[PDB]
Design a protein around this motif. Structure first.
Motif, PDB file in Angstrom:
ATOM      1  N   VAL A 197      48.679   7.118 -33.049  1.00  0.00           N
ATOM      2  CA  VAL A 197      47.677   8.128 -33.369  1.00  0.00           C
ATOM      3  C   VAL A 197      48.209   9.125 -34.396  1.00  0.00           C
ATOM      4  O   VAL A 197      49.182   9.832 -34.133  1.00  0.00           O
ATOM      5  N   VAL A 250      43.926   5.708 -36.228  1.00  0.00           N
ATOM      6  CA  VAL A 250      44.443   5.012 -35.065  1.00  0.00           C
ATOM      7  C   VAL A 250      45.024   3.647 -35.439  1.00  0.00           C
ATOM      8  O   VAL A 250      44.314   2.767 -35.929  1.00  0.00           O
ATOM      9  N   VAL A 277      38.906   8.184 -29.670  1.00  0.00           N
ATOM     10  CA  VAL A 277      40.301   7.896 -29.970  1.00  0.00           C
ATOM     11  C   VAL A 277      40.851   6.960 -28.911  1.00  0.00           C
ATOM     12  O   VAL A 277      41.652   6.086 -29.203  1.00  0.00           O
ATOM     13  N   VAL A 308      42.728  15.151 -27.177  1.00  0.00           N
ATOM     14  CA  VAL A 308      43.048  13.757 -27.439  1.00  0.00           C
ATOM     15  C   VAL A 308      44.253  13.333 -26.596  1.00  0.00           C
ATOM     16  O   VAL A 308      44.201  12.309 -25.897  1.00  0.00           O
TER      17      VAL A 308
END
Length: 188
Positions: A22, A155, A182, A46
């Motif tokens: 990420v 990603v 995500v 996230v």
């Protein structure tokens, strides 16, 4: 379908091998980045939904704020090398965008002194070769994805978040959808 290429995320036509899992880009000059971090707390929400085994990387970019912009990217490298991101991120955003008291590399240094980092330690980091390569990593990653705007999140070198395609009526609901996207993308 619920998650669709071209709506919550875009797929890179030109994938990037070996990328962080990420990867977040921002700029302390970036008003929306100020929102993401200070108000929406995106990075945090996230992290809180990322699975087993996935690290989060955040890099600064050069293409806003000219000379100070680059200084801030070197300062962020320092923050990464010292592991004090969580101590300087808020005063750096506020010094650049709220009080506008950051106008020079010296003012950037002041924020680190006030955050309790020793000048001696900051100056050595600032000048060290480990920071320079950390500066280079930040630049290479931005370059790999041909990055022209921030905030941005990628990603697995594959997918770029597309928040434009999300309701923004409630902030909390935007944040979780973003976070959920995500996580989805990560499990892909």
């Amino acid at each position: 379908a619920q998650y669709e290429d071209g709506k919550q995320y875009t797929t890179l036509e030109k994938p990037v091998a070996g990328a962080p899992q990420v990867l977040e880009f921002f700029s302390f000059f970036c008003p929306h980045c100020y929102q993401f971090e200070e108000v929406l707390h995106i990075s945090d929400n996230v992290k809180k939904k990322l699975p087993e085994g996935v690290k989060m990387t955040k890099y600064h970019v050069n293409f806003m704020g000219g000379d100070l912009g680059k200084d801030l990217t070197q300062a962020w490298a320092v923050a990464m090398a010292l592991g004090v991101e969580d101590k300087v991120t808020v005063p750096l955003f506020e010094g650049v965008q709220k009080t506008q008291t950051i106008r020079s590399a010296s003012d950037i240094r002041d924020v680190f002194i006030n955050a309790g980092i020793k000048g001696e330690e900051y100056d050595a980091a600032w000048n060290s070769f480990v920071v320079k390569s950390l500066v280079a990593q930040q630049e290479k990653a931005a370059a790999d994805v041909q990055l022209r705007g921030v905030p941005a999140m990628f990603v697995n070198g594959k997918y770029q978040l597309n928040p434009q395609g999300m309701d923004t009526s409630n902030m909390d609901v935007f944040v979780q959808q973003y976070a959920d996207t995500v996580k989805y993308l990560s499990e892909k």
